[PDB]
Amino acid sequence: KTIPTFEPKESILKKLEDIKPEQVKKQTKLFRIFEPRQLPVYRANGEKE
Amino acid sequence: LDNMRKAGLTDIPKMIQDWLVDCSIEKFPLMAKIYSWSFHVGFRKQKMLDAALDQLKTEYTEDVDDEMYREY
């Protein structure tokens, strides 16, 4: 019998003694956004070096 | 009462039919008497299976509310 699947939201709780304090962040790699890259280059008149 | 007659009952529809003209409570104990004459005919000791299938018939649908079940 295919019973339907009623899922509440259930709002998962704790109590104060069971609140874990924190875990400190030690740093990983240096958080880059940019990187270098070789590209070709083209002298004026358009042609290439 | 039509089902009652279709089963083969004549006098007891008549007692239930002639009472409705007044619907009085003084003649009414007859009904109560009748309501007890039904349970002195016996048990319907049928099989465990077919008696369960009076209960084990299900029609479950994905068309009911959710506003209702969540409040429930």
From TrEMBL, chain A:
Give the domain of life. Answer: Viruses
Q: Partners and quaternary state?
A: Homodecamer; each decamer is made up of two conformers of VP2, called VP2A and VP2B. Interacts with a VP1-VP3 complex. Interacts with the intermediate capsid protein VP6. Interacts with NSP5. Interacts (via N-terminus) with NSP2.
Q: Which organism does this sequence originate in?
A: Rotavirus A (strain RVA/Monkey/United States/RRV/1975/G3P5B[3]) (RV-A)
- Record text about domains: The N-terminus binds RNA. It is necessary for encapsidation of VP1 and VP3. The N-termini of 10 VP2 molecules form a cylindrical hub underneath each 5-fold axis of the inner capsid.
Of the parent protein, the shown chain spans 100 to 148 of 887
Query: What is the name of this protein?
Result: Inner capsid protein VP2
Q: Where in the cell is it found?
A: Virion
Recorded family membership: Belongs to the rotavirus VP2 family.
Instruction: Describe the processing and modification events after translation.
Output: Sumoylated with SUMO1 and SUMO2. Sumoylation of viral proteins seems to have a positive role on viral replication.
Protein function: Inner capsid protein that self-assembles to form an icosahedral capsid with a T=2 symmetry, which consists of 120 copies of VP2, with channels at each of its five-fold vertices. This capsid constitutes the innermost concentric layer of the viral mature particle. It encapsidates the polymerase VP1, the capping enzyme VP3 and the genomic dsRNA, thereby defining the core.
From TrEMBL, chain B:
- Source organism, top-level taxon: Viruses
Its annotated compartments are: Virion
Q: Membrane-spanning residues where? A: none
Q: Which protein family is it in?
A: Belongs to the reoviridae RNA-directed RNA polymerase family.
Functional description taken from the UniProt entry? RNA-directed RNA polymerase that is involved in both transcription and genome replication. Together with VP3 capping enzyme, forms an enzyme complex positioned near the channels situated at each of the five-fold vertices of the core. Following infection, the outermost layer of the virus is lost, leaving a double-layered particle (DLP) made up of the core and VP6 shell. VP1 then catalyzes the transcription of fully conservative plus-strand genomic RNAs that are extruded through the DLP's channels into the cytoplasm where they function as mRNAs for translation of viral proteins.
> Quaternary form?
Interacts with VP3 (Potential). Interacts with VP2; this interaction activates VP1. Interacts with NSP5; this interaction is probably necessary for the formation of functional virus factories. Interacts with NSP2; this interaction is weak. Interacts with VP3. Interacts with VP2; this interaction activates VP1. Interacts with NSP5; this interaction is probably necessary for the formation of functional virus factories. Interacts with NSP2; this interaction is weak.
Entry protein name: RNA-directed RNA polymerase
Q: What is the organism lineage in this UniProt record?
A: Viruses, Riboviria, Orthornavirae, Duplornaviricota, Resentoviricetes
Full-protein interval shown: 292 to 363 of 1088
